[PDB]
Amino acid sequence: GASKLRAVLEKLKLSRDDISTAAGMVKGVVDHLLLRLKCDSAFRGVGLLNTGSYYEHVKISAPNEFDVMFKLEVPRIQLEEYSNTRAYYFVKFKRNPKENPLSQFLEGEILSASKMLSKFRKIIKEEINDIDVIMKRKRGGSPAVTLLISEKISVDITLALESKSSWPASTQEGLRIQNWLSAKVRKQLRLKPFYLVPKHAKQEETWRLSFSHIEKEILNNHGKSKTCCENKEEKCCRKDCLKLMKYLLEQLKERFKDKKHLDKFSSYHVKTAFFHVCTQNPQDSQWDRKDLGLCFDNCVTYFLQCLRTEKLENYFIPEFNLFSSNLIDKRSKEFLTKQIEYERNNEFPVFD
Numbered sequence: 001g002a003s004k005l006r007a008v009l010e011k012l013k014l015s016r017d018d019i020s021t022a023a024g025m026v027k028g029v030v031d032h033l034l035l036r037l038k039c040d041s042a043f044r045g046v047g048l049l050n051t052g053s054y055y056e057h058v059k060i061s062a063p064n065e066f067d068v069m070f071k072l073e074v075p076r077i078q079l080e081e082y083s084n085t086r087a088y089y090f091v092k093f094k095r096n097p098k099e100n101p102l103s104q105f106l107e108g109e110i111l112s113a114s115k116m117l118s119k120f121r122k123i124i125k126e127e128i129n130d131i132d133v134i135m136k137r138k139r140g141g142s143p144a145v146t147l148l149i150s151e152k153i154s155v156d157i158t159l160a161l162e163s164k165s166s167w168p169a170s171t172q173e174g175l176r177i178q179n180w181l182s183a184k185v186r187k188q189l190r191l192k193p194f195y196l197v198p199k200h201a202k203q204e205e206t207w208r209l210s211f212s213h214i215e216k217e218i219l220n221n222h223g224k225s226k227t228c229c230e231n232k233e234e235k236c237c238r239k240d241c242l243k244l245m246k247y248l249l250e251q252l253k254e255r256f257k258d259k260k261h262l263d264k265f266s267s268y269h270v271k272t273a274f275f276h277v278c279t280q281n282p283q284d285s286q287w288d289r290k291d292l293g294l295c296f297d298n299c300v301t302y303f304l305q306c307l308r309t310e311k312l313e314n315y316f317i318p319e320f321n322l323f324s325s326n327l328i329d330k331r332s333k334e335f336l337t338k339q340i341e342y343e344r345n346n347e348f349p350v351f352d
């Protein structure tokens with residue numbers, strides 16, 4: 001049916017809307033960090049990616065785990081695509097006022113992420129002690145810093161570069177929303193800046209393109225009809241589908257944390273699948289609140305087709321396959337397929 005999914009969705013909203021001092025603990029820590037990074041040569045133009053929002057939650061099950069982004073406006077950037085990866089880039093500068101605020105991190109002509117991250121970490125490490133806050137150092141690149149307030153509160157900090165120039169060539173054929181959100185909206189969205197986060201593909205001074213802000217924007221204005229979800233008549237189940245798929249992967253990832261099979265999968269994989277189903281189903285009538293279950297099943301069916309065909313194109317970079325053999329091995333994909341197919345056929349036990 002579509003009854004139980006609603007109760008999952010009610011439990012999820014009640015935790016989310018519940019009164020907690022958590023966001024206030026987070027707010028004080030980040031405002032203090034931002035004030036200390038600003039009175040420093042390299043990070044004087046630092047700020048929160050989305051102001052007003054400190055309470056950003058990636059894990060839809062964990063109301064105690066926060067994720068924050070620190071954007072840095074980098075003017076006159078030159079990017080070089082690393083090893084034809086389409087999403088991984090070197091950072092160079094057009095060079096006009098040569099003694100630019102980030103010249104101190106230049107390793108030759110290429111901008112060192114590691115050098116920039118070390119200073120960012122060193123500035124934060126020295127401000128935590130000054131404050132109940134403690135930091136942990138975790139590999140990968142970004143999140144750079146991870147903070148722990150009290151016992152349950154956890155905060156991931158990601159350093160990002162902001163570029164107000166045109167999106168790289170690898171995105172040219174991406175964001176295929178023309179028949180859903182319109183060609184007018186695509187051009188507007190693509191006029192918006194883009195972010196680079198420190199990341200590699202297994203170790204160089206590379207940066208991955210990030211479009212968190214586009215995702216947030218589309219989600220808060222997701223209909224073909226401009227009035228979608230504003231009234232009683234136009235209530236769609238798009239966000240509810242996204243939430244249920246996110247919960248599904250989070251529940252399976254917890255259920256199988258002892259084994260390492262679902263370690264490569266994340267919300268990126270679940271978000272990208274949903275957005276591809278949004279393109280496939282552009283009409284609001286295809287997302288009626290009465291069809292929750294049928295709608296959710298088409299999301300689960302598409303994701304299942306992606307795992308099996310080993311194909312999940314990045315929504316912005318269509319040549320980047322999230323499900324490639326070098327990214328995720330067949331063994332890990334087949335383990336996930338079987339786990340979901342059992343969930344589909346047993347009235348999703350994880351959701352109770």
Ligand SMILES: CCCc1cc(=O)n2nc(NCc3ccc(-c4ccccc4)cc3)nc2[nH]1
Pocket residue numbers: 087208209210211212213215266268269271272275314315316317320322327
């Ligand atoms: C709306 C669709 C979801 C979405 C949100 C967002 O914020 N972004 N930002 C990018 N940028 C390129 C990019 C390329 C690859 C990976 C990746 C992920 C996992 C494993 C291995 C690689 C992550 C980012 N794509 C997205 N898609």
Ligand SMILES: [Zn+2]
Pocket residue numbers: 222223228229234235236237238
């Ligand atoms: Zn809607």
